[PDB]
Design a protein around this ligand. Structure first.
Ligand SMILES: [Mg+2]
Lengths: 212, 235, 195, 222, 240, 233, 231, 204, 244
């Protein structure tokens, strides 16, 4: 797995790979690793696939109940804390979860919370989780600026997953892109890594080590 | 004294029959179902001019496709609304779909007779539950503290109910537009209200398939009141 | 988390706490504030197992804030530390104990004295002129034993603290990404933004 | 020490067409090196034009199918005989599976049917309830033997158009029910040759707007 | 456990235990709330039947629920402590989970919910208390004032009074409070609040308490002398 | 979680044209000690069902009492207890299968393998298996423990698939069962010579045969076998 | 009088007034008819509306593929009892792979209703039920009273003016019992029976509710234009 | 790992002529790391003195517990608790945690106010009472203390002679233990005066 | 069933009063008078035992004045048995607080806790309320010397001088007349005994009919001492103030 999310001028970029493995066996290349909690909030899926699926859909139900009761959009801080408090109750039982809860509200602006199954809850600007996280961090750290355009930020997220997909054996398949704005998230397509690699190699001049 | 779950010699539950009397003392609420949507309207009935009337919340959202109006001891309705909202959301979690308006109503009505010596007494509030689903279209239900619910084409509850229902009997037909229904609720509310009807002491709302449940602005309702006045002066 | 230090000088308590947050292989954050303000003149820094640290700290914060509102009165540092110790002493024999070590730095407005308490996850409390948790003491205590005076100024305390951090940065294998330093005195709590 | 789990072998396969869906599975049931039964049905009609199979530990498999069939029954009671849509069935099964998150149903579940637009649908579950809609999914013992073949012959992976040499992919043209059944039969014939737990018989359930139809084929019994 | 249904309907559709709880509120000392343009003032009556009282330690009538919200009441004093405690716990619980202090409306809705619950739970009687809850939402400068009562209904008020002779002071407020132009300053708002209590109180000495709540957790209680200056200025204008 | 103490070995069974046959030996082993020699492991329920049980004997005796209680309970307020509303093999099996799976799911299993053999109301043959894990399966031939490895291969030569059932008479089926019991006596170290056999036929009903013995055994060839390789004397 | 304050009190003549008052609620309810032959069993129910804008209250509830009932009295109590029957039918199928006998279903309803008549705090059920079903001993019709008394019958009726339909069925007994293999004629006899209980009002398309179960017929309910054929 | 030797420390008590003495070191540590040189292990409730060695969190917890219990005792009984009675209370309190015990080694010392009789007692972590006439020892250097006390002790020592004996017993025992030392306190207890003396010792 | 015999102890009257609380207060009005007076340098507690006998062992007897901790004491008016139940609860609460915070419980926090317990019996449980009124005399380092009272309703208030039990109307008037803010303990001792002497239903006020206590900072330097007076000491202070 490789999942990332980063804050910038135009909001948040979320980018994930698509591969799921059972040992060396590639179970699926078409896994949806971004959960659509609601039209404004996104969550990423790393660790236990079921745990992330089940509890982040549940989170969507809790967010809906909040805004029905309070007549106001739930904050990213409050939404992330509902999830982190829940998994903390299950601490020790064996839940496996590493997720970024991403949202863009009036009072907060673009906000990302890393939530963990040991109970960790961290606010931050750039997060990267999975077996291929170290590869994606390299591309992110050396190219990240706050004043990136939406177009360039989307590409950076795509390129960082590609970097991981290439080197990490347990990452690949395809890249899913999302752009989170204040008015909600916008899906920016599914990108097959096989086709994307050759396209990027030619246009960018990168991956000279690989023969194409 | 006597049991809370006691039957009368006529075969009625004393406490349920008495709660129905409390609902008769409540402010008027009216619902009208059409093929373009369902309209819900209420009398706010502020006890003093210093009471900020927009804080009177007698029309409430249960889900995007289900709204609800209340009449009687309105404090009792809060836990009923909470349950309704939870039931609507829970069903979406379990089944990845909207819940049927009837099923939601049935879930609310299951709470009603859970009283004895569970809660200590029945609810002292009646509900008009309005909504839309793909199977049965636009629907309006009347949920009582007896646990019984009837579907209605149009229904009025509260202190001006029997006078309003007689008026709804004459006015409703199967080809009403949404605009016609809005004016009709306003007309009948104005008839049964003690004080003169305006945008501050009355409230409108509707549920459509496209836009879902919406409570009307005071500015929007004020225009419909002015439109009503002119069309009644037109003959 | 990793390094948390404390030093009580003439008129204030100074708490230094690392900024790193490492999840295994990667350093996820380098600006983490491992502290909570319990009351206007009481600060608690913390280190231990992930999740449990913040959960415990916020739980204590909520309880002290609740007391402050109920009585319209700020509890003494001694009283707060005794409350915290009991919670940890209760915790250690629980089904799943809080794995959290804390330092409580406060200024007692009644006695006009700074106070530093060190409490580990077992509920072991000690009042100290200077303290630490984990391996932090192993590197720093020899320096503090030598230079510490009870009549030090806040500026002298910060200088002695810099020497301690420098020794940590030299001999410790882990990169803890520097420290956030906060001062607790009669005027309350403030952060030294350049360290 | 008592081991509450076992492995009854078996292999299942779900494929979603344009206006149909198939769910196939071998009829052999085993423990270790012994055959329990040469014909033990594994794919079930659960009503509402939904077919299901929970492959792996047969006791947990039977329990789950039984509970889902029961859920369909109570869905009708509680919601005015409303038809349970395939997406709603899938979400319901997640909750059945996750309910035993800390003592799981040791099965790989697949359901098949039509979505609310009448298009073919297949959903695939892990033992603790993570799920996804898929076009093609093999499960069980010989899943690793079948899926690569399906990638190549259903999705035309690694196939390009002659003359272009890698520049143009082979276009993804829609397959008929007769074409899919051919690929299913060849998948199980090949799996039977190379996997010891696969054989005896192949039972296929086909789902269309007209209903559920069954087809049976003999497999090698060695 | 004791399960007896004490709050029940009567043939005429009334719950007498809830209505008798209102009679306890009628007996309680008068409380008044007035919101200006940038403040809310809570006034409270102190019955002078009790002198030799120690005013330092005696429970004050206005209570802080959080640093930005206050609660006053009329009715049973012992009952009010239970509601205040529950509200204070909920205020901290909200900060802990939502990472934001309660809105005045939310806190009111919670207290009103507790009051309602005690009207249809077995083995309990309703609270003999009506409350005035005032304050400012976090990062908001719009004044808030709400009222609750034993039945559990609640609503927002431009100005409101509860307790004994509240009918009289509500009469005063209804003719003296203009919605188009509320008391523009703290002075004007306090003056109107003291004036309203002087219709009912008796002596303007230690019988009137005033608490001013401003935005951003700025809450202060006026002293005897400060209030006494308002009392003096009001009657000197009245002698005309 | 436990361990079996006193145990019963193979239960074997098969379908034939008009019904089913089931058999099991009369031994209750205590490890390698052949402790109890008069244990009945086929338990009839009414006149249409026979439940064969292997594994832990204390748990068998518990299951035996559950079935006895099931008959009592079925007769309560049931005028048709000996007619239309009598216990079917399919009812008895489903009940046991429920119990077995529930018990494994509480991590406290009934340490058994069970075969329910019988004939239904409509004359259909019933033969299904359930064990300590709650695993169930049906087949023209069924066997537990060692029987699964040695009896099934022999019984499958008579009825290899469903279409062979109408072609198999009760004489041929019983012959095959009796031969399998002999083979098991040769080769299973925890078996005995004495066994019971039950036939449930749709026409002639339930025939329960006790005190049967393995006969026509071949041992004479043993006299010629000497040493383990090179020895001649 | 002094002995009707709760269900736990016998009168001096040995009567249970709270149970009798619960029985009274059934008499206020709308009429419903039950009858059977040797192949089929039929329920016919007159539904009641609140007014002309309202829907007609449903009277028939399905319990299983082979069983269901009609109600007269407190509808929420019928929902509780029918839900219990659904569970008991379901328990029998899941645990024993066995369809629950109609007679045994009656025994279970009797015992559930009885517990509410002997304990303090509770109240009797305020509804009467007519259960039809087809099991291993053919067609069946049961009448449930909230006193606990359950009775197997060829035909019956409960609710307001039910005496007219009950007399008709008592005359027609020898005719309708012989209507085997003809569902339409058995329903006709039921529609003609319930007509003996009508006054002022007649059977319309949204007024009538019919259910049937039989040899090769799952329990199915007919409403709306599906019953126009029988009007 | 072993809870009774994480923090370290020792307590010793002796009897003399019309007097008792109880003494302790001042060290608290985290295994090898010295943490505090002011961690006193002797407490008193009225005229009854209690020393506690072992896991420090339990030492603190038990002191707070026995303060709690002796305060309620005094309010109800209208008199201060006696050493013999308190000994039974410690025993009772420890045994109630039989299968989840406090990891401690308590030592009671005092003079009965009515009889004037000197009294000392010791306990294991689970409540068994050791009521010795001569001396009681506890802590990580209990072996060393047994050796010192057995040779140095003689009965009926005067208060100022008993001080020297118990002080030398503690000091030399602590200097042969890595987890004891860093200062020491000695209490000399007579029927109506108690003297507390801090000893000068090596700080390694 | 059982409902028939239920008195319903926790209901409002039509006037909005709690029947049982009102009747418990009526009970307390027949109890021996207890007085508390707060001075600048201490607090006085004085209380009258109810019609005693010559054979009553006075020196070991306690029916009025009780110790909650070293800093807080109470005077009782009402059912003695009910008071002891609450007193033991209060003693435990004080110790719980001391264990938790390592500081003595502030007087008001203890008073609020007991008062909340009394309140609970008026709102839920269906039990009769405690027929007890307390005068709390205490000291802490926040407010210094404090006097409180609580009654069966669970309502509590602070006082400079206060009486409970019998003839409170007459007693409170006499206290209101002679009390001044700059008063000292020795003056307050005299006022308390003079007030009881005038309000008593007995023919004369003697040592055997009294319980007496003082909370003074008349303890050597910055600390507080409680003094429960002995029979002989009450006899001496009666002679000193000139009542006998
Ligand atoms: Mg094979």
């Amino acid at each position: 797995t490789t999942t990332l999310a980063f804050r910038f001028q135009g909001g948040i970029i979320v980018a994930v790979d698509s591969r799921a493995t059972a040992g060396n066996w590639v179970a699926s290349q078409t896994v949806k690793k971004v959960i659509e909690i609601n039209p404004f909030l996104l969550g990423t899926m790393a660790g236990g696939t079921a745990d992330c699926q089940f509890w982040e859909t549940w989170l969507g139900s809790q967010c809906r109940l909040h805004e029905l009761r309070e007549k106001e959009r739930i904050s990213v801080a409050a939404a992330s804390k509902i999830l982190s408090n829940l998994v903390y109750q299950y601490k020790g039982a064996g839940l496996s979860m590493g997720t970024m809860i991403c949202g863009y509200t009036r009072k907060e602006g673009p906000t990302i919370y890393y939530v963990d199954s040991d109970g960790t809850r961290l606010k931050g600007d750039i997060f990267c989780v999975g077996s291929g996280q170290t590869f994606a961090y390299g591309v992110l750290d050396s190219n990240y600026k706050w004043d990136l355009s939406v177009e360039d930020a989307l590409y950076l997220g795509k390129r960082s997953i590609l970097a991981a997909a290439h080197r990490d054996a347990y990452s690949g398949g395809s890249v899913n892109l999302y752009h989170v704005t204040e008015d909600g998230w916008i899906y920016h397509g599914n990108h097959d890594v096989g086709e994307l690699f050759w396209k990027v190699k030619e246009e960018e001049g990168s991956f000279n080590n690989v023969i194409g | 004294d006597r049991g809370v779950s006691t039957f009368s010699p006529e075969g009625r539950l004393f406490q349920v029959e008495y709660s129905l009397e409390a609902i008769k003392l409540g402010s008027t609420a009216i619902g009208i179902a059409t093929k373009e949507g369902v309209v819900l309207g209420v009398e706010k009935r502020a006890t003093s001019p210093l009471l900020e009337s927009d804080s009177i919340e007698k029309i409430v959202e249960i889900d995007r496709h289900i709204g609800c109006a209340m009449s009687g001891l309105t404090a009792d309705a809060r836990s009923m609304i909470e349950h309704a909202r939870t039931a609507a959301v829970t069903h979406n979690l379990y089944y990845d779909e909207d819940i049927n308006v009837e099923s939601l109503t049935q879930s609310v009505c299951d709470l009603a007779l859970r009283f004895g010596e569970l809660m200590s007494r029945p609810f002292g509030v009646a509900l008009l539950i309005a909504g839309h689903d793909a199977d049965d279209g636009y629907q309006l239900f009347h949920a009582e503290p007896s646990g019984t619910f009837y579907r209605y084409n149009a229904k009025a509850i509260g202190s001006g109910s029997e006078g309003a229902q007689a008026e709804l009997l004459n006015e409703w037909h199967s080809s009403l537009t949404l605009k016609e229904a809005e004016l009709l609720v306003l007309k009948i509310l104005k008839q049964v209200m003690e004080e003169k009807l305006d945008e501050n002491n009355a409230q409108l709302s509707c549920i459509t398939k496209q836009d879902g449940f919406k409570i009307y602005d005071n500015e929007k309702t004020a225009e419909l009141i002015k439109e009503l006045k002119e069309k009644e002066a037109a003959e | 988390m990793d390094i948390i230090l404390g030093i009580r000088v003439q008129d204030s308590v100074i708490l230094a706490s690392s900024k790193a947050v490492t999840r295994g292989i990667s350093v996820l954050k380098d600006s983490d504030d491992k502290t909570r303000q319990l009351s206007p003149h009481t600060l608690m820094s913390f280190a231990g197992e992930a999740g449990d640290t913040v959960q415990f700290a916020e739980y204590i914060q909520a309880n002290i804030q609740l007391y402050s509102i109920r009585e319209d009165y700020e509890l003494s540092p001694q009283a707060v530390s005794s409350f915290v110790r009991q919670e940890l002493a209760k915790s250690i024999r629980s089904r799943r104990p809080y794995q959290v070590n804390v330092l409580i730095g406060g200024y007692d407005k009644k006695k006009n004295k700074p106070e530093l308490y060190q409490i580990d996850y077992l509920g072991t409390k000690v009042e100290l002129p200077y303290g630490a948790h984990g391996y932090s003491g192993f590197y720093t205590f020899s320096l503090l034993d030598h230079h510490y005076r009870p009549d030090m100024t806040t500026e002298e305390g910060l200088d002695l603290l810099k020497l301690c951090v420098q020794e940590l940065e030299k001999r410790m294998p882990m990169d803890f990404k520097g420290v956030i330093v906060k001062i607790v005195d009669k005027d309350g709590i403030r952060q030294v933004d350049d360290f | 020490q008592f081991n509450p789990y076992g492995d009854n072998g078996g292999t299942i396969l779900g494929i979603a067409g344009e206006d149909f869906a198939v769910l196939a599975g071998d009829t052999r049931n085993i423990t270790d090196y012994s055959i329990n039964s040469r014909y033990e049905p594994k794919v079930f009609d659960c009503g509402d034009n939904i077919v299901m199979s929970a492959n792996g530990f047969a006791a947990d498999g039977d329990a789950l199918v039984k509970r889902f069939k029961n859920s369909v029954k109570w869905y009708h009671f509680d919601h005015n005989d409303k038809k349970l849509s395939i997406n709603s069935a899938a979400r319901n099964i997640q909750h059945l599976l996750y309910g035993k998150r800390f003592f799981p149903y040791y099965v790989h579940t697949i359901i098949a049917g039509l979505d609310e637009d009448g298009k073919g649908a297949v959903y695939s579950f892990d033992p603790v309830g993570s799920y996804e809609r898929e076009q093609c999914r093999a499960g069980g013992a010989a899943a690793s033997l079948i899926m690569p073949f399906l990638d190549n012959q259903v999705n035309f992976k690694n196939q390009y158009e002659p003359g272009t040499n890698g520049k143009v992919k082979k276009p993804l043209k829609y397959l008929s029910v007769e074409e899919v059944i051919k690929l299913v039969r060849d998948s199980f014939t090949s799996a039977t040759e190379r996997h010891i737990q696969v054989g005896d018989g192949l039972e296929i359930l086909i789902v269309t707007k007209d209903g559920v139809r069954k087809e049976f084929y003999e497999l090698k019994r060695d | 456990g004791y399960d007896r249904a004490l709050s029940i309907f009567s043939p005429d559709g009334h719950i007498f235990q809830v209505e008798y709880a209102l009679e306890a509120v009628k007996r309680g000392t008068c409380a008044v709330g007035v919101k200006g343009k940038n403040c809310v003032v809570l006034g409270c009556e102190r019955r002078s039947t009790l002198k030799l009282q120690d005013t330092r330690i005696t429970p004050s009538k206005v209570s802080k629920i959080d640093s930005h919200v206050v609660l006053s009441f009329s009715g049973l004093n012992a009952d009010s402590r239970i509601l205040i405690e529950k509200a204070r716990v909920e205020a901290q619980s909200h900060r802990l989970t939502l990472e934001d202090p309660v809105t005045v409306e939310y806190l009111t809705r919670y207290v009103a919910g507790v009051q309602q619950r005690y009207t249809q739970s077995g083995g309990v009687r309703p609270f003999g208390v009506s409350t005035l809850i005032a304050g400012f939402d976090p990062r908001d400068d719009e004044p808030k004032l709400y009222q609750t009562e034993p039945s559990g209904i609640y609503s927002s008020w431009s100005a409101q009074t509860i307790g004994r002779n509240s009918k009289t002071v509500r009469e005063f407020l209804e003719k003296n409070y203009d919605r188009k132009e509320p008391p523009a300053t703290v002075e004007e708002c306090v003056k109107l609040t003291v004036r309203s209590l002087l219709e009912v109180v008796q002596t303007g000495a230690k019988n009137i308490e005033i608490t001013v709540v401003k935005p951003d957790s700025d809450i202060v209680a006026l002293s005897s002398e400060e209030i006494n200056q308002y009392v003096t200025q009001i009657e000197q204008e009245k002698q005309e | 979680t436990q361990q079996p103490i006193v145990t019963g070995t193979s239960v074997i069974s098969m379908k034939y044209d008009n019904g089913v046959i089931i058999a099991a030996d009369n031994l209750g082993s205590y490890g390698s000690l052949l402790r109890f020699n008069g244990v009945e492991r086929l338990i009839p329920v009414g006149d249409n069902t026979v439940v064969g049980i292997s594994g832990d004997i204390s748990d068998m005796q518990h299951i035996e009492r559950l079935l006895k209680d099931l008959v009592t309970e079925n007769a309560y307020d049931n005028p048709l207890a000996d007619a239309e509303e009598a216990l079917e093999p399919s009812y008895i099996f489903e009940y046991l299968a429920t119990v077995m799976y529930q018990r494994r799911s509480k991590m406290n299993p009934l340490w058994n393998a069970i075969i329910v053999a019988g004939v239904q109301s409509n004359g259909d043959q019933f033969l299904r298996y359930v064990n300590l894990l709650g695993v169930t399966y049906s087949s023209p031939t069924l066997a537990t423990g060692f029987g699964a490895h040695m009896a099934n291969p022999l019984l499958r030569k008579v009825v290899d698939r469903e279409s062979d059932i109408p072609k198999t008479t009760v004489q041929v089926a019983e012959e095959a069962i009796v031969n399998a019991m002999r083979v098991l006596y040769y080769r299973d170290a925890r078996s005995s010579r004495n066994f019971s056999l039950a036939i449930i036929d749709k026409n002639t009903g339930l025939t329960f045969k006790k005190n049967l013995q393995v006969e026509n055994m071949k041992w004479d060839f043993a006299k010629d076998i000497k040493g383990y390789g090179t020895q001649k004397i | 009088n002094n002995y009707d304050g709760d269900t736990v009190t016998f009168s001096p003549t040995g009567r249970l007034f709270q149970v009798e008052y619960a029985l009274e609620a059934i008499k206020q309810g709308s009429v419903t008819v039950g009858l059977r032959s040797n192949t089929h069993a039929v329920l016919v129910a007159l539904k009641r509306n609140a007014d002309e804008l309202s829907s007609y209250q449903k009277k028939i509830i399905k319990c299983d593929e082979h069983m269901g009932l009609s109600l007269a009295g407190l509808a929420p109590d019928a929902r509780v009892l029918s839900n219990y029957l659904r569970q008991q039918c379901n328990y029998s199928s899941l645990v024993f792979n066995r369809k629950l006998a109609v007679e045994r279903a009656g025994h279970l309803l009797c015992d559930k209703a009885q517990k509410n008549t002997q304990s303090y705090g509770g109240r009797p059920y305020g509804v009467g039920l007519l259960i039809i079903g087809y099991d291993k001993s053919g067609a069946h019709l049961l009448e449930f009273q909230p006193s606990g008394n359950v009775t197997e019958l060829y035909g019956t009726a409960i609710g307001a003016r039910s005496q007219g339909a009950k007399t008709y069925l008592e005359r027609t007994l020898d005719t309708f019992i012989k209507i085997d293999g003809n569902p339409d004629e058995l329903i006709k006899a039921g529609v003609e029976a319930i007509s003996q209980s009508l006054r002022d009002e007649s059977l319309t398309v949204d007024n009538l509710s019919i259910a049937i179960v039989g040899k090769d017929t799952p329990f199915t309910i007919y409403d709306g234009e599906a019953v126009a054929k029988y009007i | 790992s072993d809870p009774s030797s994480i923090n370290g420390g020792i307590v010793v008590a002796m009897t003399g002529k019309d007097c008792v003495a109880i003494a302790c070191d001042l060290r608290l540590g985290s295994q090898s790391l010295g943490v505090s040189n002011k961690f006193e292990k002797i407490f008193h409730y009225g005229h009854v003195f209690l020393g506690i060695t072992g896991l420090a969190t339990d030492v603190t917890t038990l002191n707070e517990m026995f303060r709690y219990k002796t305060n309620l005792y005094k309010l109800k009984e209208e008199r201060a608790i006696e050493p013999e009675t308190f000994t039974q209370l410690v025993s009772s309190s420890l045994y109630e945690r039989r299968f989840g015990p406090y990891f401690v080694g308590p030592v009671v010392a005092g003079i009965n106010s009515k009889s004037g009789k000197p009294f000392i007692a010791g306990f294991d972590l689970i409540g068994c009472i050791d009521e010795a006439k001569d001396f009681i020892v506890s802590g990580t250097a209990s072996d060393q203390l047994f050796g010192m006390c057995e040779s140095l002790y003689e009965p009926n020592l005067e208060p100022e002679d008993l001080f020297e004996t118990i002080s030398q017993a503690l000091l030399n025992a602590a200097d042969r233990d890595a987890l004891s030392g860093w200062g020491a306190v000695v209490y000399i207890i007579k029927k109506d005066e108690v003297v507390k003396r801090y000893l000068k010792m090596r700080q390694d | 069933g059982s409902r028939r015999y239920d008195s319903r102890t926790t209901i409002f009257s039509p006037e909005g009063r709690l029947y049982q609380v009102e009747y418990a207060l009526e009970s307390i009005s027949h109890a021996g008078t207890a007085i508390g007076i707060m001075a600048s340098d201490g607090i006085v507690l004085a209380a009258e035992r109810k019609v005693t006998s010559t054979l009553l062992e006075q020196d070991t007897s306690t029916e009025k004045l009780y110790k909650l901790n070293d800093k807080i004491a109470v005077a009782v008016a009402g059912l003695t048995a009910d008071a002891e139940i609450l007193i033991n609860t209060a003693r435990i609460h004080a110790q719980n607080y001391l264990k938790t915070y390592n500081e003595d419980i502030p007087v008001e926090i203890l008073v609020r806790r007991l008062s909340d317990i009394k309140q609970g019996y008026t709102q839920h449980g269906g039990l009769r309320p405690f027929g007890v009124s307390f005068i709390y005399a205490g000291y802490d380092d926040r407010y210094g010397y404090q006097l409180y009272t609580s009654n069966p309703s669970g309502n509590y208030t602070g006082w400079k001088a206060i009486s409970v039990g019998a003839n409170t109307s007459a007693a409170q008037t006499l206290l209101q007349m002679d009390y001044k803010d700059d008063m000292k303990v020795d003056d307050a001792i005299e006022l308390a005994l003079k007030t009881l002497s005038k309000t008593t239903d007995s023919s004369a006020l003697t040592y055997d009919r009294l319980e007496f206590a003082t909370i003074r900072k008349g303890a050597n330097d910055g600390e507080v001492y409680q003094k429960i007076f002995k029979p002989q000491e009450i006899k001496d202070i009666l002679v000193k103030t000139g009542i006998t």
